[PDB]
Every structure is written in C-alpha cells, then in structure tokens.
C-alpha cells in the first residue's frame, strides 16, 4: 500500500481518491491520502469549496515514482509533485502516519469497483492522451477539449484520444460505402483494433479512462468520446465474442458507479437506445442492459 | 443549413446547386399471390436531379434489375441514389460540379453525405418545403423513357422547355411548381387543364405545351383554382 501525501490544506477543498471523496476545511491539519492500493492507476481530484467551477485533478500510478500533493497560491491550486529523493519522502510521510494526520483510502474487501473501471487503464497510455511528459503523472480538468473537439485551440492542454467520426474516409471504404456505414465492422476491427489500438485491452483502456474523466470532471469531449467508442463496437456486426463480454462487463459497472444525480448530462440517449435496442449488439449486452433499465428506465 | 421559404431566393443565385429527390427511385406495385398473400412487383423508376437555376434535369433511370436479390430495398434506393448523384457529379467538369446538393428527404442526408465525402466543399442539406417532385413521372415524356427503359440510363432534360428565353428562373421554378403541386393533388384535373386545347402542341423536344406568355397565365390561374378546390374537397371548406 502506498501514499500521496500533502504540504497542507490552505483552502477548504473535496478531496476525491479514486471513487472516492471527503470533505477539508480552510486549514484543517490535512496531510495526505494512505493505504492506496497498489496495482491500479489512481486519480486525485479536487473541488474548490469557493468556486465549484473546475473540478480538477491528476491520474497517477503509485508504482511510477513518490507524489505528494502541495497547494500552488499563485496558481491556486493543489498540484501534484513528484520527489526524487525517496529516503526524504518515506522519512516525511512515516513522520505523518505517525501524527496520524492522513485519511486511509476507504476500501472494502469484497468492493471490487475501482479494479473493474480500470482494468484496462494503464499510465503509458493515459500519458499519450494526455501529452506533459516531464510529469509521470498527467492533469486533466472539466474544461480540458479534445484533439476532435478543436478540429471543429490550445493543443498543448488537449485530451490526444483516439478520433472516431463515422462519417469520414477512414471509417468508411471506397465501393462499400452503405456497407461499411450501417455496418461499422471494418473500422472497428481493421481500422481501429487491428491498425490504431493494437488490441482490444488498448481500446478498452482509453474508453475507460475516457468515462472517468467524464465522470469525475464532467469533462464534456471525453462523455463524447465514450460514447463513440460504444457507438463503434455496438454498431458492428462482427466483435470478438470475448470483446462483447468484456464491454458487458466494463459499461455495467460504469454504469453501477455513475452518480444517480448526473446521468441526464453523462448518458446519452441516441448511443443508448441504439446500443441496447438497435444495434447488432442490441441483444449481447444483458448485464448492462438489465442495470440500465431498473436504474434509468427513464432515458429509454 | 435547412432550405426554406426564408432562404428562398437562393435556388436562382449562381451557385451551381441541384435539387435531389429520391421519391421515384423505388416503385412497386402490390398484388396477391396465388396462396392470397402480398408480394409487390417492382417498377423502373429514376432519381429527380435538377438544377433550379437552368432546368437542367438529370433523370437516371432505375431498372428494377438493381433489385434483383437485394433486401431492404426502400433503404438501398437511398443508398444507390446517393451513388448515382456522386457519380453524376464525380462525371462533370470541376467547373460545373454543384457548391450544394439539396435534398427533398431527410432520409437522403447520409446516404448523399457518405458517398459525398470525397467532395468536402460541397454542401448536402435538406429543405423544408414541402416541393411536389415526386409528381415528375405525371410528365408524359419522362414517365415514358422510364417505363420503356431495358437497361440503366441517363437521360438529359430541360424541365423548362425555353422559358427562359422569356422568364427569369425564379418564375420558371414557380411555374414549374405549380404545375406539379396541381399534377400531385388531382392528377386527372391538371392534364385535362394542359391539354384541353388541342391547337396548343407540344414541341417533340419539350415537355411542356407551347403556351403564349397570355396562355400560361391562364394555365396558372387554373392550376391555382385546382388546387384550392382539392384543397377544400379534401378539408370540406
Ligand atoms: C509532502 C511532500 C512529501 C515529500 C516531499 C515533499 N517535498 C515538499 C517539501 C519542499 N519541496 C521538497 C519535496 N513534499
């Protein structure tokens, strides 16, 4: 189990770990975030009691290097740091878990959440869509765009996810343009998995991290971009049984963890209906489809 | 963005534009089968591309060997007129290829759109007026090449005839519209109009009666009256 501790907590601040969050007042003796399990990508997350505007945030993996956390007062804001000196950072840290000032991330055994919404979800690859590479940990905040989004500015702070448009030369083969249209098959499995992902694990990753930056900041592109990525596979009649499971299991509990209270920015109903009622895939997605309707049988 | 009566004048601009409208593609008739069920029978039919500002019409023509073991055909005539307009256009000179394609049917906007995408400086968009093409193969002469047609073909047409020769293409549309409007609402009616004066011919290379500028106005008004009249036989008023 490892530990991202703090400087302080100047401003009062939620503080969110993982699925995770509690509540720190103006100068409460804060340090820090222990017992975080290791073997998983984490991200940290912070809203202002002030201003509720700009959730923000950074994933990390423990593994990759000794982090703390110490608010910024030009910036205004806590920013994730790394020490190199290891021996400074497990003496301070020890020094307090000792004065016993560090909440203990929360888990539960049998609670398998946070594995299930990031199986897939490797620090490598968060890096690559989220471009600060002097950093081993990357920023992400609600207002971030994507690289799709400002196709249609500042390319420095950008989400680089994968573009999918259904509507473009890429997804679509000269001769079979009705063909690769209503059946989506040839970009899923050519294009996408076998020419741009690799696998479907990379896929899978970079659809899962794309709902918990929806999720966790609202971050409008990257809901846009999960959607599309179940829009592709849903609307194609040729997936990998074992993809089909898996996206199964990975929506379901996507879905399981979304806060009741947001589903109405965060679902979108066309992708919806579609994936669960339409599609080819209409009838391979049971899990998802029975938490879906006993949870939000509005939408539908 | 959508094509209405508040962006009317743009039709006669001269931005190449055509008009798109798929509604005669597919044609069937329906019938019973020996054992009293349904099947329907395939027709030829043809895409109505037009443009407004000319007259220039493309009618391809749709022999119903395009359906020939395909499913879901109402959904494939969209498809395989979206073909056929991007190979109409990829066939013209840069120069007269259209700036827009407006379609009469929502339904068209993808279908175009895809087959498009190799034309990006063109734009596919819809319209809300509610225009009566489909009443095209109520003009005999294009109902006949359709119907008479044995293989695929294009056929070239000026849907004025040589109205612009005395008209402007604002008021060639209107007429143009207002003669289908009455060929759509009471089909019977709007030819007996055309027609009732056998000394009023038309040219073998028209479509149209060879009406006096006198002689249209005449057949407008009674078009009007049309009309107005299925109009009230149908809402009782
Ligand atoms: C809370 C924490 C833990 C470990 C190191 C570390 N720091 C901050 C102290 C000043 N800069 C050196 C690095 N900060």
Redesign the interface.
């Given at each position: 189990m490892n530990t991202v501790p703090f400087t302080s907590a100047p401003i009062e601040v939620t503080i969110g770990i993982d699925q995770y969050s509690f509540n720190v007042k103006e100068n409460q003796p804060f340090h820090g975030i222990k017992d975080i399990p290791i073997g998983h990508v984490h991200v940290i997350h912070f809203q202002h009691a002030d201003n509720s505007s700009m959730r923000y945030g950074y994933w990390f993996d423990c593994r990759m290097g000794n982090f703390y956390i110490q608010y910024d007062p030009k910036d205004g804001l806590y920013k994730m740091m790394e020490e190199r000196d290891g021996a400074k950072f497990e003496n301070i840290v020890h020094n307090f878990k000792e004065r016993q000032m560090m909440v203990s991330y929360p888990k539960i055994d049998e609670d398998d959440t946070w594995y299930n919404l990031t199986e897939f979800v490797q620090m490598d690859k968060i890096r690559k869509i989220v471009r600060k590479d002097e950093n081993q940990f990357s920023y992400v905040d609600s207002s971030m765009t994507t690289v799709q989004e400002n196709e249609l500015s500042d390319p420095a702070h950008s989400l680089n996810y994968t573009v999918i448009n259904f509507?473009?030369?890429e997804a679509?083969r000269?001769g079979h343009?009705?063909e690769d249209?209503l059946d989506k098959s040839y970009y899923l499995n050519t294009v996408m998995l076998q020419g741009i992902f690799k696998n479907s694990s990379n896929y899978f990753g970079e659809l899962q991290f794309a709902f918990l930056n929806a999720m966790f900041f609202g971050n409008y592109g990257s809901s846009l971009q999960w959607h599309a990525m179940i829009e592709l596979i849903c609307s194609s009649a040729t997936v990998p049984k074992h993809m089909l499971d898996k996206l199964d299991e990975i929506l379901y509990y996507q879905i399981k963890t979304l806060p009741e209270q947001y589903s109405d920015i965060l679902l979108n109903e066309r992708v919806w209906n579609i994936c669960l009622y339409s599609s080819f895939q209409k009838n391979s997605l049971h899990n998802t489809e029975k938490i879906m309707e006993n949870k939000y049988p509005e939408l539908l | 963005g959508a094509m209405n009566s508040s962006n009317y004048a743009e039709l006669f601009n001269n931005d190449i534009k055509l008009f798109v409208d798929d509604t005669n593609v597919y044609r069937v008739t329906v019938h019973k089968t020996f054992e009293g069920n349904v099947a329907t029978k395939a027709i030829n039919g043809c895409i109505f591309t037009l443009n407004p500002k000319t007259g220039h019409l493309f009618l391809k023509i749709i022999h119903t060997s395009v359906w020939a073991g395909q499913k879901r055909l109402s959904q494939?005539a969209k498809?395989k007129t979206?073909?056929e307009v991007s190979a109409l256009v990829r066939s013209l000179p840069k120069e007269e290829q259209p700036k827009q394609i407006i379609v009469t049917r929502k339904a068209m906007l993808?279908?175009l759109?895809?087959?498009m995408?190799?034309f990006p400086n063109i734009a596919i968009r819809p319209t809300e007026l509610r225009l009566p093409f489909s009443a095209a193969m109520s003009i005999d002469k294009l109902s006949d090449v359709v119907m008479k047609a044995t293989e695929p073909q294009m056929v070239l047409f000026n849907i004025y005839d040589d109205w612009l020769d005395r008209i402007s293409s604002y008021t060639a549309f209107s007429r143009l519209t207002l003669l289908l409007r009455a060929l759509k609402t009471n089909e019977e009616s709007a030819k007996m109009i055309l027609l009732s004066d056998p000394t009023i011919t038309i040219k073998s290379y028209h479509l149209w009666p060879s009406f006096t500028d006198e002689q249209w106005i005449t057949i407008e008004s009674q078009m009007r009256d049309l009309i107005l009249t299925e109009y009230g036989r149908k809402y009782n008023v």
């Open positions: 509507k473009s030369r679509i000269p343009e009705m249209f | 494939l498809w979206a073909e993808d279908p759109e895809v087959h995408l190799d």
